[PDB]
Design a protein around this ligand. Structure first.
Ligand SMILES: C[C@H](CS)C(=O)N1CCCC[C@@H]1C(=O)O
Ligand SMILES: [Zn+2]
Ligand SMILES: [Zn+2]
Length: 229
């Protein structure tokens, strides 16, 4: 079920995996939900994406302390927009090591974000260069190509059926891809397909702006991105 904790919502997805959800009144769009992940790996916790704000991100850390009560070893954030990186200062205040695509860190100042402390780089095939993601445990980080933004990255969780598409993937009944001012309209469709191909056995697709869905989310996104080229 949806566990309400202050203004945030937490949902367990697997024995060691939870979805965090936070909301921001974005004028003209309503109160917009954004999802990220919390993963327990043995005696430590790994976070995927901040909440929209520092205060909300501190509340994620409070929930972790209450429900898991293990240290947060690292966080990885999936592109330089507010829903994914808006709470970076809260993670830094807590002493948590932070990681993002090198390009997200480069873009962070102009997008209004604080950069992560460490930069990920990626091989030509999209998989993270392993030395840039040390001690990531079950998190498998993949750059699918430019799409929702130039810098968007995705994360699979080893030992589960879960892959996280962030804001690249929309649910199987979404009817648009949202704002495309930062989107790569030429390459969006290929990038969405590359994410599905990188995590071929993931049956639960977690995304930023819809509840978890089947693999039909990936093909519907790619179909709609076909219409931007
Ligand atoms: C702050 C987020 C970063 S993805 C954002 O800008 N959006 C999400 C919610 C709807 C509007 C807009 C979009 O259509 O992409
Ligand atoms: Zn975005
Ligand atoms: Zn988003």
């Amino acid at each position: 079920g949806d566990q309400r904790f202050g203004d945030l919502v937490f949902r367990q997805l697997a024995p060691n995996v939870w979805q965090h959800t936070s909301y921001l009144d974005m004028p003209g769009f309503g109160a917009v939900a954004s999802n990220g992940l919390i993963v327990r790996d043995g005696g430590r916790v790994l976070v995927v994406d901040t909440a929209w704000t520092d205060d909300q991100t501190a509340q994620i850390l409070n929930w972790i302390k209450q429900e898991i009560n293990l240290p947060v070893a690292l966080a990885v954030v999936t592109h330089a927009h507010q829903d994914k990186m808006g709470g970076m200062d809260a993670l830094h205040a807590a002493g948590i090591a932070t990681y993002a695509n090198a390009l997200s860190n480069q873009l962070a100042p102009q997008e209004g974000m604080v950069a992560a402390q460490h930069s990920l780089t990626f091989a030509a095939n999209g998989w993270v260069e392993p030395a840039t993601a040390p001690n990531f445990g079950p998190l498998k980080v993949f750059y699918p190509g430019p799409g929702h933004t130039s810098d968007n990255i995705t994360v699979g969780i080893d030992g589960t059926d879960i892959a996280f598409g962030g804001c690249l993937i929309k649910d199987s009944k979404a009817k648009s891809l949202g704002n495309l001012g930062d989107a790569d309209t030429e390459h969006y469709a290929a990038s969405a397909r590359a994410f599905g191909a990188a995590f071929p056995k993931a049956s639960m697709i977690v995304m930023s702006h819809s509840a978890p869905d089947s693999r039909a989310a990936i093909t519907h996104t790619a179909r709609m991105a076909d219409k931007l080229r």
